[PDB]
Amino acid sequence: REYTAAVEAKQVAQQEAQRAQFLVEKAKQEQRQKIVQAEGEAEAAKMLGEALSKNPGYIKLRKIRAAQNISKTIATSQNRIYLTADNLVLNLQDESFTRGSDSLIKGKK
Amino acid sequence: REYTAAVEAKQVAQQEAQRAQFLVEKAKQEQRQKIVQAEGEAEAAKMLGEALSKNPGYIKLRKIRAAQNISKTIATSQNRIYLTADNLVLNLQDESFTRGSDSLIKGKK
Amino acid sequence: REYTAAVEAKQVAQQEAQRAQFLVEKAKQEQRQKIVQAEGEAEAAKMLGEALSKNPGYIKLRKIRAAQNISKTIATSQNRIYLTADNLVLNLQDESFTRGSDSLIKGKK
Amino acid sequence: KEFTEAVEAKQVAQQEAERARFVVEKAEQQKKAAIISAEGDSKAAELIANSLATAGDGLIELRKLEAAEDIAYQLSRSRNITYLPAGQSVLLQLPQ
Amino acid sequence: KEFTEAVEAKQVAQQEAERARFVVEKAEQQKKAAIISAEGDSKAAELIANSLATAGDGLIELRKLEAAEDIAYQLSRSRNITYLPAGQSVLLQLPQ
Amino acid sequence: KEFTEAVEAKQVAQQEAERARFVVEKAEQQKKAAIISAEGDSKAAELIANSLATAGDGLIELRKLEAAEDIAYQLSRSRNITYLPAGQSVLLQLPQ
Amino acid sequence: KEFTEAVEAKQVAQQEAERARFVVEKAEQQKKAAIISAEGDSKAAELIANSLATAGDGLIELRKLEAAEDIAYQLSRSRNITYLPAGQSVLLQLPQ
């Protein structure tokens, strides 16, 4: 079973070493394609880095809008979870109520 | 199957690269459409900063009103979020009653 | 049972020990085969080490993007998990909010 | 079975390698498209960033408050969502 | 029975040994090709690493925010997953 | 048979392209009108923001009261109500 | 019963002594064979350590992470897996 199988495997492995350098080429083309897919991801990466790493203005607002896209997606989310209480600062009558978001005075944030 | 598919896909790929420049135009248009969704968001942003970076007043008041609205739709929310003891002070008799209600003092807010 | 079994074992073992030095050879070729499969892996590894060891830019973004890939997979996941909720940092009214994504300023990440 | 399959794979792979040179071209074009769409999103975002940086954190927090209504709106289409205060020593113990 | 089995194994070992020497050569070609698919991925990764090192952590955090939406999208196709604070004395429990 | 279906899908994509042309125009229009619908709701916000930056939270005190009556009737539906502490090292076990 | 069995064990144990002589002649060879298959694994590994030392933790990390796609592909056939943050007072519990 494995004797003729291995001999034919050696011959087809000559053929497939030729076709495996050919795979170098073809999967190189699919490599550029997948590079380019994850590099549209990466151009999102660049764009957002240059835009919002100097100072996260919309990365602040995207902590926000993407915690809310996460929690516009928490519908699927059976997930038990825990945010923090001083996050939603449901501390309405508190000293640290607007320690949470008088951090709007930049420096606390 | 993948041979005829590949060749037809190469010809369709030439015509679809032309249509892909057309797609670049169409996606600049979608660029504008989502630019503007979050730029109505951003009109809110630019003005809310100019009116609150002075001192977060509607942001104080909108932590309060977003806590109120968060409660308000916690009503329909099954969420086993909570609050806890002693800020909305319903230790209705307490110093903390004058440290959650007198927490409204500026400096403590 | 064990007498004839042992005698046939010894004879079959003479020819099988010839066959098993021959297995040193055979398993050596399988050795190099497994070597080169996990070397596709390994030189992907060398290349990624030049990609990332210099600076964990995509090590950071891939902690996170593998988070999201692992997550697209955690669809099937039952695995009961945690965050540190200051990881997405959904801290939707908080100072620690803009400590999570003022880590955008390189150095805290 | 691997001989004819290997020959057809080589032929299909040459067709796909030329088609994939043109698909790397298509990928540059489709990335113009995807960059510009994800940047519909993200250029809306950068103009929001400019608004919040020049004006301050106004709607940083106020879409952290308006969209914080989304928390109470949308947390418990499931049944186990909640939170836990910080600056403290919480004994976190997730529900069952 | 082990007699014929082991002799057949000897002949199979000869053919597999020569086979596998050339499988190692074909695997030099295929290691290049697999490095190349992993290059699709990993070279997207080189350009991402360069992009983020040059431009800070924008999408380090914004695939931690934008594609963190994936976390809510996916975490819960089962019913016992969660995400939960720290920076405290959190004394985690996990459920039945 | 499947060729007709594939051509139909291609035509559907082309019709989405036309719809996106008219989304171009709709995008011009809500440029104007979404910027300024913001302007409206948002200037309710401008002045409340200034009024309060000067003094502090005035209207959801009175409307903790008024919106208590009304939408905290819409909260007297909220089955589980508790009321948080803070300013101390608060530590918690919570509902399952 | 143990008289005939004892005599049989006597003779068969001497035969197994000689069979041991050549079973670990065979097992000089079989130690080598198993050594060498595990060496295929472990020399993929020697040069993997070489690749990730001459280059670094790139894919020491990313065949954690690209392979964490596999973490999630493989874990979930089970239904009680977890991963829970450090920097806390975790009293980690387990499900039922």
Numbering used by the authors:
A (entry chain C), B (entry chain A), C (entry chain E): 191 to 299
D (entry chain B), E (entry chain D), F (entry chain X), G (entry chain F): 177 to 272
Question: What are the paper's exact sentences on this?
Answer:
Prohibitin complexes are dome-like structures consisting of prohibitin -1 and -2 heterodimers that assemble in the IMS via their N-terminal transmembrane helix. Prohibitin-1 and -2 (PHB1 and PHB2) are members of the Stomatin/prohibitin/flotillin/HflKC (SPFH) protein family. Among other proposed functions, the prohibitin complex supports cristae architecture and negatively regulates the activity of the matrix-resident AAA protease (m-AAA), which cleaves numerous matrix and IM proteins. Three-dimensional (3D) subclassification of the subtomogram averages revealed two distinct conformational states of the prohibitin complex present in untreated and OA-treated cells, both of which resolved to approximately 20 Å.
A second conformational state became evident from 3D classification of the subtomogram averages. We refer to this state as the open conformation, because density is absent for approximately 25% of the side of the wall of the dome. In the open conformation, prohibitin 1 to 2 heterodimers are arranged in an asymmetric spiral that are flexed outward by 2° relative to the closed conformation. The open complex is also roughly 20 nm in diameter and protrudes 8 nm from the IMM. In the open state, density is missing for the SPFH domains from 3 heterodimer pairs. The density quality and resolution are lower for the open state, and it seems likely that the open state density reflects an ensemble of related open states rather than a single unique conformation, as highlighted in Movie S5. The closed conformation manifests additional density extending 3 nm on the matrix side of the IMM, while the open complex is associated with minimal matrix density. Quantification of the two populations of complexes revealed a statistically significant shift from 75 open to 56% open after depolarization, indicating that the prohibitin complex is basally in a dynamic assembly of states and that depolarization drives the complex toward closure. On the basis of its two distinct conformational states, we propose that in untreated cells where prohibitin complexes are more open in confirmation, the open state is “active” and allows access of the m-AAA to its import substrates for processing. Here, we found that like HFLC/K, prohibitin adopts both a closed nearly symmetric structure as well as an open asymmetric conformation.
